[PDB]
Symmetry: D2
Subunit: 95 residues, 4 copies
């Protein structure tokens, strides 16, 4: 995907923003005096997320979250996140 051209916000966009305002207050304690959607861009996403347990020596492991976009023969990847100080038998939980 390639994000589209800048599009004007609609009533949906504002509904989405109203939801997000509450989430930002509740979990990241972020407050604003107004929260008015102005515009957006869209981006198609289609691929595979990998959650990978990697041994990094002795008792040490890390977990990786890596995204691989379509098509199937695409081999370029994005490291989206990771977890430090993981142990051998830890579960691969989403993050």
């Amino acid at each position: 995907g390639a994000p589209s051209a800048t599009q004007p916000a609609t009533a949906e966009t504002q509904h989405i923003a109203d939801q997000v305002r509450s989430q930002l207050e509740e979990k990241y304690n972020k407050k604003f005096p107004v929260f008015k959607a102005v515009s957006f861009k869209s981006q198609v996403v289609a691929g595979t997320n990998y959650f990978i347990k990697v041994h990094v020596g002795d008792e040490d492991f890390v977990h990786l979250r890596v995204f691989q976009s379509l098509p199937h023969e695409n081999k370029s990847l994005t490291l989206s996140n990771y977890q430090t100080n993981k142990a051998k038998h830890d579960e691969l939980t989403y993050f």
Copy 2:
């Protein structure tokens, strides 16, 4: 082909090729080379949907950018919050983040 994460699968050469490709970036993080970097196991999760980057006015000259995701199918109207950035300006581009 669910969006549910697969069960845990043992690493293959392709899993290792992924680990090799991202290793140096991670090694920057910890400021050191890993003596070893061996893929052991993985889960896969199909992702297919639309990201939206949304510019929000939060008063005066202050803006916020949001990244939200809407999964397929097209009739799904649920979106989840992926990331946000504060301290943005009216003419700041909606660039990926």
Copy 3:
């Protein structure tokens, strides 16, 4: 968000908008206008993967084109046959079909 077809869902205005948009094309088929064209129900199926258009030599100057589909995730190696065309030439473009 499976690739499994959903359960049957009653039609919504969006289902009807889809029916309206494709109606004239179908009406060409039957050589007549439908007096009515009312969406009743639907199933949805998420599709996400790679189409491949493959040129195959079948001897002398004769070729076949194939369309096959590979679903996500990336480690899926199963493909299914979607369409084929015979009577093609060595320099015929791999155009969608």
Copy 4:
């Protein structure tokens, strides 16, 4: 998606072609003296297929298969196939 540039066939491509040769003989009784993969293009596909039961008057219905590509705000559609002479209570089966 937009199909890629023409790529040369590999051993996989040939494995896929060998499978298809058998399917074409068995179901469409098509035989060839050779079946050698030469080249391919790829195309990303990501969207929703709709199978839709449409009333077309009195006892008459049709079933439609329509593809809607991402992004979510895309409203252009492709009629991929249809079934004639359907009845009211027929199941929406894949086709």
